């Protein structure tokens, strides 16, 4: 589609495999903001956005957070906190005509810069001056849309390019686009190294009836510490307790007198670790 009519495809309920995308060599630009492409396999996302459009060659750099430009301001705007990846490739073999492909339009003038991630469809005649247009193009009446002159004979920097950007959003929702990872059997009441839909961490998975949790998944404490989590496979309320901490204090007389010590682990009920309590 065109710049001012960029498509947006909803992606959900996926066993998403990004390895085939990474290993493909048909993409000239492969840049990701905030996520390592090799690490895309294990992560789980609640939703994925795929936006596709076609722009000029020199504007591939303009697609980035905190960037300014005609298309950046009047056609397409990226949030400053954007996370995801950007994919773009040349399309001379498909989107070029010797007579000039006139099917691609982009906006020239508008009242003010548009907010990030919003679409403009209205094709009203721009009022560049004071003379009322009244739907009639003329002086002080510029049509905001211009058509790209894409031809196979044009320069490399001017060539048409197809742009597809992937944006990943994460929040406290059940993730539905996960990667090809096998879920293992559950083991509780032991110090394990769990992973609940990307929620990494260590601890012991005791069974606790914390509350009903009719629609909630996570449980938090004073700090950003997930206390209780809801299983993704079945529906039960597990409880996270960190492993045992403490300190090793050494009780010793003077090394001049003798060579003996006595170790003290404070705040440790060492039924699990001449034993004293």
């Amino acid at each position: 589609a065109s710049v001012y009519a960029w498509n947006r495809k909803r992606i959900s309920n996926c066993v998403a495999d990004y390895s085939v995308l990474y290993n493909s060599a048909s993409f000239s630009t492969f840049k990701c903001y905030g996520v390592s492409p090799t690490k895309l396999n294990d992560l789980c996302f609640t939703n994925v956005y795929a936006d596709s459009f076609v722009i000029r060659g020199d504007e591939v750099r303009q697609i980035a957070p905190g960037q300014t430009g005609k298309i950046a301001d009047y056609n397409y705007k990226l949030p400053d906190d954007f996370t995801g990846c950007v994919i773009a490739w040349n399309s001379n073999n498909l989107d070029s005509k010797v007579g000039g492909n006139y099917n691609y339009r982009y906006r020239l003038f508008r009242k003010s810069n548009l907010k990030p991630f919003e679409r403009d469809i209205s094709t009203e005649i721009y009022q560049a001056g004071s003379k009322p247009c009244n739907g009639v193009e003329g002086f002080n009446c510029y049509f905001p849309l211009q058509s790209y002159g894409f031809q196979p004979t044009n320069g490399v920097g001017y060539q048409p390019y197809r742009v597809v950007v992937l944006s990943f959003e994460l929040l406290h929702a059940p993730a539905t686009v996960c990667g090809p990872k096998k879920s293992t059997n559950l083991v509780k009441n032991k110090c394990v190294n769990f992973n609940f839909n990307g929620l990494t961490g260590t601890g012991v998975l005791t069974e606790s009836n914390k509350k009903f949790l009719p629609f909630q998944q996570f449980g938090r404490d004073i700090a950003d510490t997930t206390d209780a989590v809801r299983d993704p496979q079945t529906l039960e309320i597990l409880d996270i307790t960190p492993c045992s901490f403490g300190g090793v204090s050494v009780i010793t007389p003077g090394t001049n007198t003798s060579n003996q010590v006595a170790v003290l682990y404070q705040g440790v009920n060492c039924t699990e670790v001449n034993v004293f309590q």
Partner: antibody
Amino acid sequence: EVQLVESGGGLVQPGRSLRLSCAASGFTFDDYAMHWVRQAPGKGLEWVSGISWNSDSIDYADSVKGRFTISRDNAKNSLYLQMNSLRAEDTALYYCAKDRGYEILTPASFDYWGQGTLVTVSS
Amino acid sequence: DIQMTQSPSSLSASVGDRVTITCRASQSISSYLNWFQHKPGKAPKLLIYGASSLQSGVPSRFSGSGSGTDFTLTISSLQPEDFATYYCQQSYSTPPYTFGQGTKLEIK
């Protein structure tokens, strides 16, 4: 896996017209460009005409300008080629090729062809 | 008008040989060349679209190269199913889709 079968080959006098068809069944006909190719009995391939994914851009070879009118029917997956005022040099073999893109003038070339239908221009 | 030329006329090799078919364009076409394998008994097929891009569905034994006014096509083995005629087509100049002459390949 795509099928391209033509019709309309026969024997006609010089200056007389005859009508071609070509049936496509193995793909989606509504979003590809189509071309016609000519194979002389004792020479190589030669391009004749092409039409876009829709009836917007149409181009003809220099030697067949003003004589051929390539049509298209997206409803039943069938294109046409009306040849008018045939001469003796048009007794070649005509193929019904398919373009990889959706435009009549692109680096995209012809990926799938079909068995031709032989025509003769003689008395 | 653009003239499209074929340097070889007829070549012969063996089942374990390696030959190169070259195609020269009079005017620069900027890597916009296509190669077709026309078996004389059935419909022709496509091997390489663009200068050096290999279409899915044919063995990776074939390899193309060249840009501007000089191009080349090579076959690494010439297996017993590769006897056919090869054409080079340009898709960049105003005369639409000018084909080059044939190049027969009979292995013996």
